[PDB]
């Protein structure tokens, strides 16, 4: 009943060569707050960055890439989605 959605993290221009996935339930309508709490979770686990570091950073964002080829870029310094539409997630902090 769950799926793995791949994610990548870039911080200060560097990105670990790990293949990393987030667990989601199949065919579920979630909000962007649902995705952000998972993004902040893997940001802290992988690169030690929590909310304080995002407020001290220059720009910070995550991008949800969708299977239909669209994307949505969401600001981390400042709608619902179905989990089966999500192709991948990318996070970038400067």
């Amino acid at each position: 009943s769950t799926i793995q959605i791949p994610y990548t993290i870039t911080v200060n221009g560097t990105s670990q060569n790990i293949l990393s996935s987030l667990t989601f339930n199949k065919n579920q309508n979630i909000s962007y707050k649902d995705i952000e709490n998972k993004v902040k979770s893997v940001l802290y686990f992988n690169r030690g960055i929590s909310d304080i570091d995002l407020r001290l950073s220059k720009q910070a964002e995550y991008t949800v890439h969708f299977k239909n080829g669209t994307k949505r870029v969401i600001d981390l310094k400042s709608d619902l989605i179905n989990t089966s539409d999500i192709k991948a997630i990318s996070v970038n902090v400067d």
Binding site: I5, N12, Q16, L19, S20, K38, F45, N46, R47, D53
Partner: protein, 223 residues
């Protein structure tokens, strides 16, 4: 592996495939056997729960050559820095020793800070993505060239040539990529490097951990 080819099966019997539990999901890395009870990999491949597969070629099949062993201890370098990806090296003590055979056996490590020419020809292998759109089920490999440090110094603000190696010609689409972290850089059949980080695009140069810089830590930790 970007721009490489499928390995001849079991031609690299030190290769380890790592499945890592990471809240809130899972991660995959490579690694390599350095003694019957120890796998060397990257520190950012750490997790509370790690399964190691040796002897694999097609990791999506339960092959009759594979050995599945949990990690007993996952020992990151004490000065590992997650934010800058510095000192990115980890030893996995296996919960039991591997059954050593033709398809499963360790790779040699260099001697005390043995160097590596810019222009040296090295091979990296793993099960990582082959592009931003495609993966692989089987082990792939590619030959890469050690770079002058200047190439990484000006794009990676935390690259340190005493502890890391600048690898990959930027004029070629050849690179280790997502999933190849922890795998070895082999030059003259010795593991000099550990895949560590790059650009999210996979465009080289990329940064490897320099194994010879950590030999005294490696030997102390394995005893």
């Amino acid at each position: 592996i970007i721009g490489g080819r499928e390995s001849r099966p079991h031609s690299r019997p030190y290769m380890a495939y790592l499945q890592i539990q990471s809240p809130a999901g899972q991660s995959r890395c490579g690694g390599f056997l350095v003694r019957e009870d120890f796998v060397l990999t990257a520190a950012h491949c750490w997790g509370s729960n790690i399964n190691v597969t040796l002897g694999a070629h097609n990791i999506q099949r339960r092959e009759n050559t594979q050995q599945h062993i949990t990690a007993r201890r996952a020992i990151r370098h004490p000065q590992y820095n997650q934010r800058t990806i510095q000192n990115d090296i980890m030893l996995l003590q296996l919960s039991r020793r591997v059954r050593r055979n033709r398809n499963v056996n360790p790779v040699a490590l260099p001697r005390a800070q043995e160097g590596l020419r810019p222009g040296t020809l090295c091979t990296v292998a793993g099960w990582g993505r082959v592009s931003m759109r495609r993966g692989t089920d089987t082990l792939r490999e590619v030959q890469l060239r050690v770079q002058r440090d200047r190439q990484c110094l000006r794009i990676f603000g935390s690259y340190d040539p005493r502890r890391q190696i600048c690898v990959g010609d930027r004029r070629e689409r050849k690179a280790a990529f997502k999933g190849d972290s922890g795998g070895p850089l082999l030059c003259n059949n010795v593991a000099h490097g550990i895949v560590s980080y790059g650009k999210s695009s996979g465009v080289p140069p990329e940064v490897f951990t320099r194994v010879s810089s950590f030999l005294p830590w490696i030997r102390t930790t394995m005893r």
